Write a protein that binds this ligand. Sequence first.
Ligand code: NZ1
Length: 165
Amino acid sequence: SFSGYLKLTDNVYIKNADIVEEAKKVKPTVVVNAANVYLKHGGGVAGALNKATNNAMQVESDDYIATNGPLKVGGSCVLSGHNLAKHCLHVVGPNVNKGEDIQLLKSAYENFNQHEVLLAPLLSAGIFGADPIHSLRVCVDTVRTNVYLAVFDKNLYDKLVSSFL
Ligand SMILES: COc1ccc2sc(N)nc2c1
């Protein structure tokens, strides 16, 4: 199963890891993508997960958007996990660099509660512009299922662990 994680709470675990390398190693039931409403996996976690699937995630996502239209900010959809996981849960956290309501981060994390165990990044962190310390706090206060958080940046990982209440 998941190895090398630091236990933060009863159900939240954290590791300094590349979520792509982590997914290829574990091949979890669910890997969470830090998606946008259009499922355009250009950069950040989305660009990295999509590149690991040789663009199969983007091809599948474009067909999903053509049929269903865009997701809502705070919403999600379950698609294939390709070579990384059984499924990919594409979750849209608010992008504060696009003026989206940070209050939607709790709604975004509520999507994780539909899955018993997930490999995930911190929602709205990185290129989404939110404070990762706040994202971790919303994660532990919202997610009740088993969430294994992969934090790419060692210095951010240390700051998250050392400041965790
Ligand atoms: C390989 O690129 C990336 C980019 C962002 C993230 S967040 C995370 N935990 N792992 C990654 C890996």
